[PDB]
Amino acid sequence: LDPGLQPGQFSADEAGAQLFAQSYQSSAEQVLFQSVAASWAHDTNITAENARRQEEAALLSQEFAEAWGQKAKELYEPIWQQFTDPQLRRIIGAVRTLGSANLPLAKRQQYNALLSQMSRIYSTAKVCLTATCWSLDPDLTNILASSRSYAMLLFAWEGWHNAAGIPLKPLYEDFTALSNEAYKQDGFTDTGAYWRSWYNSPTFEDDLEHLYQQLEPLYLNLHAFVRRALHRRYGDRYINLRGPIPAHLLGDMWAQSWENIYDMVVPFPDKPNLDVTSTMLQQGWQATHMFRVAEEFFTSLELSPMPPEFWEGSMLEKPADGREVVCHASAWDFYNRKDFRIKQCTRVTMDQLSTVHHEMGHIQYYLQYKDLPVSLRRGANPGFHEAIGDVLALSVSTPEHLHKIGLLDRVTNDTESDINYLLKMALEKIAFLPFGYLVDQWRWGVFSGRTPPSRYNFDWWYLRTKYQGICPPVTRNETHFDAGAKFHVPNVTPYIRYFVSFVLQFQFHEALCKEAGYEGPLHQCDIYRSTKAGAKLRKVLRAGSSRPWQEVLKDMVGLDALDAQPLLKYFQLVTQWLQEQNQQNGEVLGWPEYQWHPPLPDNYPEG
Ligand SMILES: *[C@@H]1O[C@H](CO[C@@H]2O[C@@H](C)[C@@H](O)[C@@H](O)[C@@H]2O)[C@@H](O[C@@H]2O[C@H](CO)[C@@H](O[C@@H]3O[C@H](CO)[C@@H](O)[C@H](O)[C@@H]3O)[C@H](O)[C@H]2NC(C)=O)[C@H](O)[C@H]1NC(C)=O
Ligand SMILES: *[C@@H]1O[C@H](CO)[C@@H](O[C@@H]2O[C@H](CO)[C@@H](O)[C@H](O)[C@H]2NC(C)=O)[C@H](O)[C@H]1NC(C)=O
Ligand SMILES: CC(=O)N[C@@H](CO)C(=O)N[C@@H](CC(=O)O)C(=O)O
Ligand SMILES: *[C@@H]1O[C@H](CO)[C@@H](O)[C@H](O)[C@H]1NC(C)=O
Ligand SMILES: [Cl-]
Ligand SMILES: [Zn+2]
16 A cells, blocks of 8 residues: 555544544545546446456555554544544444455455456346347347337346356355455444444334335235236236236336336326337437436536536447446446546436436435545435435426426326326336345345355245245246346345335425425426425535434434335325226235246247
């Protein structure tokens, strides 16, 4: 480690700690910068040489983290918890958690190489037919979204899961052991316990379970209604009205979001078409229009525009030179208070427009907290960070707002039109809930050792069936590693944040709508141009992780806890409607034929 980046000496007290944090701050930015830059260079241009550079950068970060971590632990270990400055406690607490920096050098290099190889496998995996091969984004994504051929969807689903999952498995095992070894030296029973500690809630798991209990009936009814719509198209052979839905038929590789099957499920097709994808295509929208439209929502609230550095640096389309990139949309803070970027292989669709807002919400958080200490540049919790862009996207999605931006010619205000809208939103928001909940249940079980490698797939499918009521459309065994075919698993990005975000965003929505002085139905609120709503949201953003999330939430929404009531309020009309419809159709709620799998198509997989 560079002499300039090394910690000096400070007194064994709070006044020393302060100078410690400020000295940390000065060097941490450069170290964070070089790490993020190397990661950027790799993720926008996947090469062996860029991987080597990124690992080298990661080693430097671990060296830095070890030095300042051991210094923090040398001077402040039995005393930091009693510090009077709560922000300083949070800075110190972060600095003294070494993570992977606890590993000896050889194991550090192993760990860094595993992360690099897992990332490369996921993002360069292909499905091949001919010499021609399909990438996940955009090829397989488009098939899952718009093909209605059972056999073709199966080819894409199986192809992807086989291609990404199978080679990831041995690496993922090794990563798990090393991660646990690292965090066990920070005092956590396993990595999952460390991840859960970010919510600073001794009752976190029970609180999530209580939330899910309230949400589950909404999902069960949506599921039964959707299954019926699928049965009408795919027939009795491929859809079991009392069994799980085959996992490839829901519009999405992970069946995580069901908005792409909206045309099959739309209750009243004679009302205005609420999926504006075809209109965006008709009008010739490109990625840059999408990002500018997103930005203009943020400025309408008197939040920050995207700086020149964002526009100059970002990767907003998949590169045309055909170079390998990480296509999964992400938002980047370079920690120099200047560079902030999105990397998205943007496609011209309504869901992608929502995704643009999601990523821009991350950027806005970065812009607002850029002048806090580096350790405090994160959300009040990770679910807050995930919720910002989605909150705005809720307003953007409204038929009224779409009309304002020229994406919906007709405007209607009737019960049918409300049901269509709320159903479309349920496909996006309700359908996701089980998946957002289950991923880290799976991962926590793996970190804790409850799920050994011998049960990775058995336990993944247990949870997928239990929560989502889906089944794999082909037979799977333990050679398959279907959890690894989801981005966040090989890229080691925690998932419970998305479940938290999906509850939280409705709490935020309700509060900002109230602040905007909006008086109507919650699901028709558009906060666009509300400078009052903007100021309320800005208070959250500028706080970063400087204050307990429970207190930041209290200030914003009047409650110090996650609460399903705003989501329930928002969906109330369609919750009642689906329940009525299912009863009148004589549906079974759930999937009591839990063992059921669909047969293979006759000529699978030739032609
Ligand atoms: C779409 O339509 C709904 C429903 O509108 C109501 O019912 C219709 C069948 C007609 O009879 C309408 O004349 C009638 O307003 C609209 O929701 C409604 O918005 C109004 C005005 O913002 C709300 O009234 C307010 O109520 C609060 C107290 O809650 C008072 O403080 C205010 O002074 C104000 O009078 C009303 O609560 C609300 N109705 C329901 C059932 O939620 C909606 O605004 C409209 N949307 C669009 C996009 O046009
Ligand atoms: C993708 O990454 C490679 C490195 O792996 C880049 O190629 C290098 O570019 C530097 C600086 O422009 C040159 O000095 C080197 O000669 C190149 N090195 C190697 C090993 O080829 C490449 O430019 C990157 N591509 C894009 C489009 O950014
Ligand atoms: C696509 C994207 O980057 N956004 C994600 C986070 O990775 C997100 O908001 N949530 C879920 C579901 C989704 O609709 O994107 C995800 O795993 O992608
Ligand atoms: C799992 O399934 C594949 C193909 O369906 C098969 O080739 C393989 O033998 C099975 N793996 C094991 C370990 O039995
Ligand atoms: Cl998280
Ligand atoms: Zn995100």
